[PDB]
Amino acid sequence: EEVD
Amino acid sequence: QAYAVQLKNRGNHFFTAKNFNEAIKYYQYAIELDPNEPVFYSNISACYISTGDLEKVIEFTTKALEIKPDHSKALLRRASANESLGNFTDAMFDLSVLSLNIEPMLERNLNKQAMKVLNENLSQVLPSNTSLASFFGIFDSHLEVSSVNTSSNYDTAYALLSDALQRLYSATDEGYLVANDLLTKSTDMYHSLPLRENAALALCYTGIFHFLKNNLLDAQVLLQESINLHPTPNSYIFLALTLASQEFFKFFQKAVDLNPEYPPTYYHRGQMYFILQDYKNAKEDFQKAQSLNPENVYPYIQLACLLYKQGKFTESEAFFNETKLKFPTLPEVPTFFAEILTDRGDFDTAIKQYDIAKRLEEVQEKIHVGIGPLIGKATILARQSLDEEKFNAAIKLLTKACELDPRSEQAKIGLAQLKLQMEKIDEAIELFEDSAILARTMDEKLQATTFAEAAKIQKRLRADPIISAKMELTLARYRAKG
């Protein structure tokens, strides 16, 4: 779901 | 390095707008300028999980984790794709590493794995000698052996049946194995063939052995057959146990009707009342059992246990003491009392009572309480134990118990938990897996398989020096902070  | 970060951020922009193909293109662009950054590979795996390509998720999380093995998002993503692909052991491994840097994800994967292994394993064996001696303890051994009719003109199987019952009621390791064997033989011989009464008797005991071996359907078939041939209290008791409230009590009234003076009828019914919290009717039935067989220790025991469960420990203790005076050499007395004392929190007196019971059990020719005292003392000692003397003492007792009663799943489970605690994991796994085979119900089997599957992950974690060091550091820090 989340990108760095 | 700096332009690669700029490209990653451009890729992040495309990711946010759900343009995953453009995001991957920019992340791969960044990799072409700086391939040593794990985040780029990790970001690509986020794109592949959002589209549903689980295989590529594994490829790219792995590439991230080959650079940075503690990368949290790459560990979580890899575990997610692994779970989806059915690689539960792999998921559990990544989640365990993550937990060291989740708990319901790990448990979910453990339960998926345990359920899988149990089904594979599922697609004849007697319970422990201790359990058998306990089950048959209420019966009048002379009466049962003597119940074989010798007055038949056609029964050629009576003498074999007599032997089967003598061996059963000898209450010995070998006796149970021989009885099981000869009872099966007798049933076959009676199927081929006072005779009807003997046939029903053979089928009744072969039936209860099926119940004890966990063949519930085979138990009911031979028992109903036994009732059809010649109904006895035993057969109704045994069928009621096989089918365990309304039906249970119906069978017992039929047992009562056939012989109102048969002690085990009231004992077993009192046990159900006891379990159902009906202390009044339990008491009255145990008292009926006692009057009909005052030489049997078990009715006394249950009356004492009832006093404790009602919150009358002083009266219970006194009843146990009174029972001691009537039965001074029977290990059953201090064994059940030690159980009460343990539950009350009195571990000191429970150990003393278990020591008495062990001593009394050793001198008896028959099995009375078997390895019960060994398990009881060892469980207390393990709980009381940094205390290396008590821990190793608990190991010795449970090892002895496993050697004396090899078919006891309780002993194996007990020993395994301790083996696991001292990082004898291979031993723990084997014990847990043997316990799963020996286990009775589906939930007890799954429980033991769960212990084994969880232990195998521990083994896998421990095999890595870095993870092992991390695990030991965690424990050391915990203890120091305490």
Give the residue extent of every domain in chain B.
Answer: 1-122, 123-482
The verdict on domain B1-122 having CATH code 1.25.40.10 is: yes
Distances (CA, A) of B242 to B198, B238, B239, B326: 21, 6, 5, 33
Distances (CA, A) of B241 to B46, B192, B252, B404: 57, 28, 10, 28
Q: Which residues on A lie below 8 Å from B73 (Cβ)? A: 2, 4
Interface contact B61, partner A, CB < 8 A: no
User: Reduced to 3 states, what is the DSSP secondary structure of residue B146?
Assistant: helix
Closest residue, chain B, to A3 (C-alpha)? B43
Resolved by: X-ray
Nearest by Cα to B366 from B115, B93, B170: B170
Q: Which residues on A lie below 8 Å from B50 (Cβ)? A: 1
Closest residue, chain A, to B45 (C-alpha)? A3
Do the chains contact at A1 and B46, CB–CB below 8 Å?
A: yes
- Amino acid B205 reads Y
For residues B256 and B352, what is the distance between their CA atoms, to the nearest angstrom? 40
> Which single residue is written with the structure tokens 């006692």?
B290
Q: Which residues contact B143 (CB under 8 A, 6 or more apart)?
A: none
For an interface test with A, the pick among B73, B75, B77, B80 (most A C-beta atoms closer than 10 Å) comes out as: B73
A4 vs B16, B23, B73: nearest CB: B73
First to last CA, chain B: 45
Nearest by Cα to B478 from B470, B35, B377, B365: B470
Long-range pairs for B460-463: beta carbons < 8 A, 24 or more residues apart: B460/B89, B460/B93, B461/B93, B461/B96, B461/B97, B462/B423, B462/B425
Cα torsion B16, B19, B24, B25: sign: negative
Q: Which residues on A lie below 8 Å from B16 (Cβ)? A: 3
Resolution in A: 2.2
Do the chains contact at B43 and A3, CB–CB below 8 Å?
A: yes
Q: Which residues on B lie below 8 Å from A1 (Cβ)? A: 46, 50
Q: Which residues on A lie below 8 Å from B22 (Cβ)? A: none
Do the chains contact at A2 and B43, CB–CB below 8 Å?
A: no
